[PDB]
Amino acid sequence: LDLAINGNGFFVTSNNGAISYTRAGYFNTDKQDFIVDNNGYRLQGYAVGPNGQLQNGVVTDLKVERANTGQLAGLEIDDTGVIFARYTNGQSKVQGQVVLANFANIQGLTPIGKTSWVQSSESGEPAVGAPRSGTLGALQS
């Protein structure tokens, strides 16, 4: 998955819980079927709950189910970040929803790499939500 944002906001990735923020990413699934960036850090969002519905109460790792029988054939993410898995038994199932974070003062963000930042005393706290909700931008591919 090659993801970009148009508008405000940052993708949220978790390194064993260390959270960083980025503008665009190449995302894959790892050996435990987590959606990860090119460092292996886990893309964060609303996961599907135990009842198969999106849990907007918790921002967590995004898992993609290998099977539904039917096994995974494709993975797509719409402009509001909803992740659709396509399976060989003719089914599709939502796997989660990518979130974006925005900041009251993104200038105050602490750079941790060429294209990644972390929260700071100067940036304010992350305000997290679905792409195209509130002031947050839209997801491309």
Q: What is the three-state SS of 10-75?
A: EEEEEECCEEEEECEEECEECCCCEEECCCCCEEEEEEECCCCCEEEEEEEECECCCECCCEEEEE
Residue type present at position 96: G
Distance (Å, rounded) from C-alpha 72 to C-alpha 4? 24
Determine how many CB atoms are found less than 10 A away from the CB of residue 73: 14
Q: Within a domain: residue 112?
A: yes
Q: Say if 27 falls within a structural domain.
A: yes
Neighbours of 18 (CB within 10 A): 10
Tokens matching residue 122:
């100067």
Angstrom distance (rounded) from CA 54 to CA 16: 23
61 is a domain residue: yes
Cα 71 to the chain's mean position, in Å?
22
Is 18 part of a structural domain of the chain? yes
Q: Is 90 left (phi over 0), alpha (psi -120 to 50) or beta?
A: left
CA 117 – CA 112 distance, rounded (Å): 5
Q: Let me know: does 8 contact 102? Beta carbons within 8 Å.
A: yes
**How many domains, the chain?**
1
- How many DSSP H helices and E strands does the chain contain? 0, 16
Residue 78 CA to chain centroid, in angstroms? Answer: 12
Is residue 36 included in any domain, yes or no? Answer: yes
β-bridge pairing 28-29 and 24-26: unpaired
Report yes or no on 141 lying in a domain: no
Contact status, residue 139 vs residue 3, Cβ threshold 8 Å: yes
Structure determination technique employed: X-ray
Residue 79, in any domain of the structure: no
Phi, psi of 106 (to 5 degrees): -65, -25
Residues 6+ apart with CB under 8 A from 17: none
